[PDB]
User: Fold 5-AMINOLAEVULINIC acid dehydratase from Saccharomyces cerevisiae.
Amino acid sequence: MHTAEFLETEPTEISSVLAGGYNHPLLRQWQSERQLTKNMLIFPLFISD
Amino acid sequence: MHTAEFLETEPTEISSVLAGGYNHPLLRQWQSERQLTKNMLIFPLFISD
Assistant:
């Protein structure tokens, strides 16, 4: 019958491995080139006569 | 006697004027390509046996 085929694979190339940089919550913050802060915000006001 | 000499000057070139981008406290924050946050910090610990 139909079984799971697994192909014969080569050793892992280092060039392939990205996962060491984003396996933890703090890392997905280390990965941002800029973080959102309060002073970045600009709020529109619509002023009536 | 010695008085203040002022040279005859040309109209201001727009290319010269940088000051409109950093005349206020909030601007010198808008001018930073990254701001310091707490999660950026890493504290060393020296552990004794």
Chain A touches chain B through seven residues (CB under 8 Å). The radius of gyration of chain A is 24 Å. Helices of chain A lie at 25-30.
